[model samples]
Target: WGYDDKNGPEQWSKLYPIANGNNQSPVDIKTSETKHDTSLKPISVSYNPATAKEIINVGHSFHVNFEDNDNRSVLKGGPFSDSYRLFQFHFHWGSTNEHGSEHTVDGVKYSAELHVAHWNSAKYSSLAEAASKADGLAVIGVLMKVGEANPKLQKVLDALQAIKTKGKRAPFTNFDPSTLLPSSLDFWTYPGSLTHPPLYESVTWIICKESISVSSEQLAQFRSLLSNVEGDNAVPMQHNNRPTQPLKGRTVRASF
Candidate 1:
């Protein structure tokens, strides 16, 4: 069962005794102390706009899975020496604008956050297996703000009627995941863990400094996919995000 306000991430260790020993993720990165290493360039991530596919209701979230062998590559060097496999991507948002994103930016909050989840190519044959390790996943976080509305996202939202059930899915044949990335490559990188259950500590978080714009309606469309098992059917899945964890002496690097 998912944790409620009372047993949320803060109380996760108590709810699931194993979670205490687990490395909690989404640590609120304080960028002040980060060193801007120009020598270590931002990883170049490339994806074909036509190879993106969406699978609905895949374990409580809408997933946009990308073809691994496509025109995708994560520059080799710096924090990680191994190549990364672009697997899938998802989002965490609020029903309203008050709060939705997991990582805060200099105390500023956004309407939502998008994650491009990837895996280390040198470690496992599949993302599932990599997800279980301590350094297997690399996630790119992009914040979403209220604006003129994103047409790319709107297309996905328009297809919601086709997949509203728990096991529902569709062939979102002609989409591209790269369209969602922020234009600015300036990002904050750090070692973290998974935000969901099993809270595995195998993630390299690359959070973009700039935010993209999405309309309120688009956000509501995302909320529609959330499970109502937590309570009111219309309450929206505002709190699906995991809370920030302790940095614990970890070093956060940034590229300007």
Candidate 2:
């Protein structure tokens, strides 16, 4: 009943009949050769870091919740409107050095990816409810590179021992996830769906052009927290991400 080599993403339909009928997400995005109208720009994001609350070990991910407030305006107008609420942020990475991201770059792979998932606030009170709908979420993707140490990542890495398994919860107060943002705000925007099961189709993905750095040690801690299908778990988390899908005639625009 779990996802293993025999029952992975590609084999989901074989394992669960309903999966065949479900809407799949994360169609691979291809860059467009047609020049985009430069006038079209992504709405500027002005965040209020003061309002963010960090929580650890929520549903197998490190998370930070953003409450509905004036600062929420930062995300308004581009893809998500008042319908979405900032719910949580988390990451997915690999154990070894080859692959660990959901989105590939020029066919090059990275060590991991970060997802900040938001939901349609107008229709649901909780992300759990939102996850059931096709239009219930918005996720911002940030790729992580292995290189020089990133001080911002240290905050979470230091806390790894506190919440090392499934269902562990820890209070991580007053931490603003914005600190993790890359120096550049330029990004590629697309209308896509969730990469996870129940693969909802109601998401607007904004993948930042810039990448952040994390030490090798920090990546090891992340791999230690994940569980595979078999009880014989020591496998690395490097390939836990979904591969890029075909664009299916969709257009992806970049914000300069």
The local distance difference test score of each candidate is 0.71, 0.63
RMSD of 1: 3.1
Q: In model 2, which range of ten residues has the least summed lDDT?
A: 18-27
TM-score between model 1 and native: 0.86
C-alpha lDDT of candidate 2 relative to the true structure: 0.63
RMSD in Å for all candidates? 3.1, 3.8
Model 2's C-alpha root-mean-square deviation from the true structure amounts to 3.8
Which residue segments of model 2 deviate by more than 4 Å?
A: 1-3, 15-29, 32-40, 46-74, 80-83, 122-125, 132-134, 226-239
Spell out the clash pairs found in candidate 2.
Answer: 28-245, 83-121, 94-237, 94-238, 95-238, 134-202
Write model 2 residue lDDT over 159-178, tens digit each, in one string. 76666554455655565666
Instruction: Report the number of the highest-TM-score candidate.
Output: 1
- Residues 19-135 of candidate 1 have per-residue lDDT tens digits of 554355666766688878777666677655566676666535667677665335443444667777777878887657766788887667788889988887786877788887777
Query: Lowest summed lDDT over 10 consecutive residues: which window, candidate 1?
Result: 228-237
Q: What is the number of backbone collisions in each predicted candidate, taken in the order shown?
A: 1, 6
Q: What count of clashes does model 2 give?
A: 6
